[PDB]
Design a protein around this ligand. Structure first.
Ligand code: 2IH
Ligand code: ZN
Ligand code: ZN
Lengths: 128, 128
C-alpha cells in the first residue's frame, strides 16, 4: 500500500518511524496514526503535524501556547500543511492530503506539538 | 511518623498527595520520593522541589531551561528551599531539610520541574 503509511506514537514519546517518503506519483497521501500504550491524551497526547522544516519550530511554539482544547495547534496556522487530531491511548486518526501541496527538493518535518521542552517527537518527510 | 512524608509520582504525572503539612515542632523534615510505573527518567522524570508560591514559576522556567543533565534545576537556584534528585521508574530519593527554613503564614509549593504535559505537577506545603 503506497500512498499511505501507518504510524504509531507510544507512551515513550516515540513515533515508530522517523522518515516518511511520499511517492511523487500519488495524487493523495494518507497518514494513519494510532496510539498503543496506556496513557491518556492529556498526559501523552500525540498528533501528526506536517510543515516545512523551516516552519516546524514556529508551529510548535504557537501550538503549545494554544492549549489542549486546540489540540495544541494554532487555529488556522497556515504553516500546517496537514495534521491529525490529537489522540490518547487506544485512539486512532487519519489524514489525507494532496501531494500537489508538496514541492520537490524541500525539507518537510512531521512532529507532535504536545508540550515537552527540547524535543522532539519528530521525523522527516520527502518526495520521491 | 511525623516529620516525614512518603510521596509518589507515577506514569500519569500525578503526585499521590497535593497538600503537605509540616509540624511546627519538627527540627527537620524528610520527603521520601518514589516512582512506581514503568517509564524511564528521560520520559517521565519526577523530582520533588520546594519554594515559595511566588518563586515556583521562575524556578520551573529556569529549571526546564537547564536540561536533563541538571535534573532540570538551575545550578544554585537560591529560590529552591529543598529538592530531591530527578528519578525514573523504580528509583527512589529522599531529602531532609531544616524546618527553620520555613516561615509561618507563607504559601509554599512543591512540584516536579520536568518539562510537562497539560499543566504542572503541583502541590502545597504549610507550617502548622
Ligand atoms: C509526546 C510526548 N509528549 C510529552 C509527554 C509528557 C511527559 C511528562 C513527563 N513529566 C512532566 C512533568 N514531570 C514529568 C508530548 N507529545
Ligand atoms: Zn505527543
Ligand atoms: Zn515529573
Amino acid at each position: 500500500a503506497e500512498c499511505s503509511v501507518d504510524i504509531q506514537g507510544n507512551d515513550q514519546m516515540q513515533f515508530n518511524t522517523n522518515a516518511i517518503t511520499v511517492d511523487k506519483s500519488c495524487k493523495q497521501f494518507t497518514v494513519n496514526l494510532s496510539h498503543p500504550g496506556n496513557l491518556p491524551k492529556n498526559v501523552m497526547g500525540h498528533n501528526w503535524v506536517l510543515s516545512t522544516a523551516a516552519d516546524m519550530q514556529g508551529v510548535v511554539t504557537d501550538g503549545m501556547a494554544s492549549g489542549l482544547d486546540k489540540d495544541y495547534l494554532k487555529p488556522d496556522d497556515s504553516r500546517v500543511i496537514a495534521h491529525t487530531k490529537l489522540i490518547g491511548s487506544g485512539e486512532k486518526d487519519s489524514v489525507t492530503f494532496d501531494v500537489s501541496k508538496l514541492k520537490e527538493g524541500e525539507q518537510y518535518m512531521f512532529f507532535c506539538t504536545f508540550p515537552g521542552g527540547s524535543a522532539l517527537m519528530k521525523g522527516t518527510l520527502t518526495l520521491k
